[PDB]
Amino acid sequence: KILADKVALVTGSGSGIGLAVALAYGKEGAKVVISDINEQAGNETVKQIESLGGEAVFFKADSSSPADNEALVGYAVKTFGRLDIACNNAGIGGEAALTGDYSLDGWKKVIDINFNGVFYGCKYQIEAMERNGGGVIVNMASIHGTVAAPMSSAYTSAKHAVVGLTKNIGAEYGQKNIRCNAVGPGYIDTPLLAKLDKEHINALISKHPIGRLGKAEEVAELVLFLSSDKSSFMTGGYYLVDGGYTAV
Amino acid sequence: KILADKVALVTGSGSGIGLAVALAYGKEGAKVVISDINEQAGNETVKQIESLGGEAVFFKADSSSPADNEALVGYAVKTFGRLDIACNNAGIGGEAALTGDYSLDGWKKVIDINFNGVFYGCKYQIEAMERNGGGVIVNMASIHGTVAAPMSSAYTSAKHAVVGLTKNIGAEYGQKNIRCNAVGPGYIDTPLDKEHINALISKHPIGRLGKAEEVAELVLFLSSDKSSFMTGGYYLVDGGYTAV
Amino acid sequence: KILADKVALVTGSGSGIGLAVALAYGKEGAKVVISDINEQAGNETVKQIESLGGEAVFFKADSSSPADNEALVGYAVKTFGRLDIACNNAGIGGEAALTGDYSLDGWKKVIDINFNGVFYGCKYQIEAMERNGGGVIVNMASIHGTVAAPMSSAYTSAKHAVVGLTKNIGAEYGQKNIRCNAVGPGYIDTPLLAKLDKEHINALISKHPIGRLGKAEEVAELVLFLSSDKSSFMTGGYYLVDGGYTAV
Amino acid sequence: KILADKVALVTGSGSGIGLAVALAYGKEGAKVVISDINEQAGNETVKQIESLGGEAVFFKADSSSPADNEALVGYAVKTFGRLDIACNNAGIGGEAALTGDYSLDGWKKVIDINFNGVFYGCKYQIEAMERNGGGVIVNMASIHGTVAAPMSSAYTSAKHAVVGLTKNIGAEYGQKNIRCNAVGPGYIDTPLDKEHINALISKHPIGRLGKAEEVAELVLFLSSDKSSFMTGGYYLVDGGYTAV
Numbered sequence A, C: 001k002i003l004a005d006k007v008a009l010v011t012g013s014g015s016g017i018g019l020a021v022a023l024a025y026g027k028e029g030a031k032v033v034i035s036d037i038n039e040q041a042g043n044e045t046v047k048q049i050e051s052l053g054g055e056a057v058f059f060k061a062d063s064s065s066p067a068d069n070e071a072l073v074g075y076a077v078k079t080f081g082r083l084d085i086a087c088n089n090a091g092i093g094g095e096a097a098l099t100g101d102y103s104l105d106g107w108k109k110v111i112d113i114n115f116n117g118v119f120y121g122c123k124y125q126i127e128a129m130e131r132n133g134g135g136v137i138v139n140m141a142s143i144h145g146t147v148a149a150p151m152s153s154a155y156t157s158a159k160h161a162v163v164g165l166t167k168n169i170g171a172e173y174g175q176k177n178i179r180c181n182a183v184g185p186g187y188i189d190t191p192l193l194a195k196l197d198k199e200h201i202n203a204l205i206s207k208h209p210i211g212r213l214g215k216a217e218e219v220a221e222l223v224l225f226l227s228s229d230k231s232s233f234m235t236g237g238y239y240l241v242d243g244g245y246t247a248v
Numbered sequence B, D: 001k002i003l004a005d006k007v008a009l010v011t012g013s014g015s016g017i018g019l020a021v022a023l024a025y026g027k028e029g030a031k032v033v034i035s036d037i038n039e040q041a042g043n044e045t046v047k048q049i050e051s052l053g054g055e056a057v058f059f060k061a062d063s064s065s066p067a068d069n070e071a072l073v074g075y076a077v078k079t080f081g082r083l084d085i086a087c088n089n090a091g092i093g094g095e096a097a098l099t100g101d102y103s104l105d106g107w108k109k110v111i112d113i114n115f116n117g118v119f120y121g122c123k124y125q126i127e128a129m130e131r132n133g134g135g136v137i138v139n140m141a142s143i144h145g146t147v148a149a150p151m152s153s154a155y156t157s158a159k160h161a162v163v164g165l166t167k168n169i170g171a172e173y174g175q176k177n178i179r180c181n182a183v184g185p186g187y188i189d190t191p192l193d194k195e196h197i198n199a200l201i202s203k204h205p206i207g208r209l210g211k212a213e214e215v216a217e218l219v220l221f222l223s224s225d226k227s228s229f230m231t232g233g234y235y236l237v238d239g240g241y242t243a244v
Helices: A016-027 A040-051 A066-080 A104-131 A151-174 A192-196 A199-206 A216-227 B016-027 B039-051 B067-080 B104-131 B153-172 B194-202 B214-224 C014-025 C039-051 C068-082 C106-131 C153-172 C191-195 C197-204 C216-229 D016-027 D039-051 D065-078 D106-132 D151-170 D194-202 D212-222
Strands: A007-011 A030-038 A055-060 A085-088 A134-141 A178-185 A238-241 B007-011 B032-037 B055-060 B083-089 B135-140 B178-185 B234-237 C006-012 C031-036 C055-060 C083-086 C135-140 C178-185 C238-243 D007-011 D033-037 D057-058 D085-088 D134-138 D178-185 D232-236
Touching: A007 A016, A007 A066, A016 A030, A016 A040, A016 A085, A016 A238, A016 D007, A030 A040, A030 A066, A055 A066, A055 C083, A066 A104, A066 B104, A085 A104, A104 A134, A104 A151, A104 A178, A104 B153, A134 A151, A134 A216, A134 D007, A151 A178, A151 A238, A151 B104, A151 B153, A178 A216, A199 C191, A199 C197, A216 A238, A216 D212, B007 B016, B007 B067, B007 B104, B007 B135, B016 B032, B016 B039, B016 B055, B016 B214, B016 D039, B032 B039, B032 B067, B039 B055, B055 B067, B055 C216, B083 B104, B083 B214, B083 D178, B104 B135, B104 B153, B135 B153, B135 B214, B153 B234, B153 D212, B178 B214, B214 B234, B214 C216, C014 C031, C014 C039, C014 C055, C014 C083, C014 C216, C031 C039, C031 C068, C039 C055, C039 D212, C055 C068, C068 C106, C068 D039, C083 C216, C083 D016, C106 C135, C106 C153, C106 C178, C106 D106, C106 D151, C135 C153, C153 C178, C153 C238, C153 D106, C153 D151, C178 C216, C178 D178, C178 D194, C197 D057, C216 C238, C216 D085, D007 D016, D007 D106, D016 D033, D016 D039, D016 D057, D016 D085, D016 D212, D033 D039, D033 D065, D057 D065, D065 D106, D085 D106, D085 D212, D106 D134, D106 D151, D106 D178, D134 D151, D134 D194, D134 D212, D151 D178
Parallel strands: A007 A030, A007 A085, A030 A055, A085 A134, A134 A178, A178 A238, B007 B032, B007 B083, B032 B055, B083 B135, B135 B178, B178 B234, C006 C031, C006 C083, C031 C055, C083 C135, C135 C178, C178 C238, D007 D033, D007 D085, D033 D057, D085 D134, D134 D178, D178 D232
Antiparallel strands: none
């Protein structure tokens, strides 16, 4: 079990990628701290991890709140005694509008969850990791941390910002045994995306050279790698899992 | 004069790069709206432009405020009839602290000015430009839109965001005649350990810091018709800093 | 005239981008050395520059030959006394085939012209520039120095290589007053492209957010900027002129 | 074992990263074809894999030669029936010289091995993989696939080319079940001024050189089914070198 004896935190873990990451961490022997805004979805992730022989607890948190982030890390350390791994995954897509039409409130919402909340998580995670000898952070970015998503300027700007924060943490903590890397998924099959029409879906698929959407499990494999000791010389990096989207 | 009859706005144009940009715009025939949080500096830029025979007005604004950004553009269009060019330059360096030690208030201040404020500027600039058949935006980013600045995580994060916003605007408004590009300066001579200065210079293969005027030349090019096929791009002016 | 008293060299200047660059240099008061494989096309560029009040000479060269590159630079220095500016523009598109199907001879041809020939030009240009106090090189890359061109692996690989060579020269000669930058055009209207069918052309246009192909003149503006003293703090850089192609 | 029953080739697997990759492949159940210009080193890798209970054969090849690359793949398919995985690792550092001083022969040698030879490998690997329903390629690039290495222009140019080739293969064969990704190592401990060594280490924020085994772990991941949605990508393993 590649994460035996480690304590890992996953934000936004009630569904999608966050769920798959939590399951992967659980399967590899980490004690997992699940966090999400939705308690029923969070408790379900815990049940699923336990049913597969893992260990997990849930802590409700608004990832945009500094205080909630601090309390989440505090809860992990109280419950399991340390924090080794954090996957900063909580994120929203935001409204769709051209930049000039983008609402002020809708902008703020996306920036506060997708970017400021990642910083607040990192800040308090770092504090715990420095106390317990170091640790590993995986920030969830997106293809849109390097290429535009028309009608989604806030999302693109926020995910770019997560890449910059990542480089900064990796550079600053290189000799303090904290590694930090960012993952950039392409479009991944969600229920949301089933809600999208079928012409929008085919248009999305056409933009992936591999000729399909990704699965949450495939993103979680790369997160697991970057969370483990296998990636010991990797820090400050951005790693695409996009089916070739950004290669063209 | 390559910007003759164009109306141009520059935020944070009381000093440094923003001043150099405003002087470049003024010298090439634009009507220039100067904005800065500091009235004395801003008024001084106007005078220097006027002294060279250009046209310029000052409007005091806090670039972190949506309302001030909207009022700045509104003032440009009221004063001169239209908005053709905008350079989003206003920004702060912020506190120096490791990410884990970065204060909550200091983080918010840097993000609000350097990230959110550029968006608020772009938003209202775009709105005005679309009324007049289009325009050109230059966002001021930094080398730290692509590489780390240890002790300045908020600045680095915000400058990365500016690059992303730029890509989005350029991609979205390609067929609506609004171009948007970002400039990435290296370290520029502005008014500090000798050892710190020498460490900075050692990181620039060209072997010296840049001058504000050298940054402004690229901004000017990107603001003119000469750059007509360039949009959504990030353009370094860094003495080789990011090449190594 | 922003290039008054400068001596500039443009390879592949008999047509397209190379032609537009030569005209721009000529208009801005440079003494221009035109080089191309085709002498009628080269002499025509000279005539055009002269007709607009400029000064120019032609020297036939195979840009893939080290000896021809050395002789070209030698001719510039003999004719006009120095070399200040070089635009390395000679290039072929190559055959279209998947990588696994790409011919060995067709690979070699594209690598030798588009990449090795750029190095041979740079080498001999640098030698002259160091003698006359420094200089400025513009290497012509392409969008395909950063993103894939399916069916054109040799072209993509070569243009990537030109970007790396550029960074290397800029880094090495930073304190020796030689600047080197690369330009990355998107798809530009040529006669070739008129030869392409109309569905291929529309497909190309759809990949440019600006919603048209570029013009050779628009590429030449950026080359002119990067050749001039206006770009004095820019070196080792790659600068896109692609209508937004690489932004998405 | 995550590569059980897979057939894998590694060029330049007599030493350094290539050896570490071959050992990783062997330990995870692959049948491994070792290739190197040096028979003694290559045969030694085979023995170390065998000693661990893996399966491996050696084939001597000059990675700059199209014919040798074709014969290496042909040997893998003849020996084991198929080719599933290839790691293109063989490369040289080349002469140390400023671009303007770089010898014509030394330039050609580096480009032929580090650029052309990777293509010749990929070409024949692709051909074999398509016969057996697909496969996975990992090209070994370097940090110098994105940033300069002063005095090593040929190496930097070639490593950039490898990144480009990788993007192309990944984009072209997306629906043909061939994935291709590139790995970008920082400086790795291999058998030289102390001052030169300390200068190298100072350029890695992690504060040390990497180990070959740490590079091989990323290659292994990218060669396995775990990386099933990853293609056309460039993946750094650099202790933060390119982050600053």
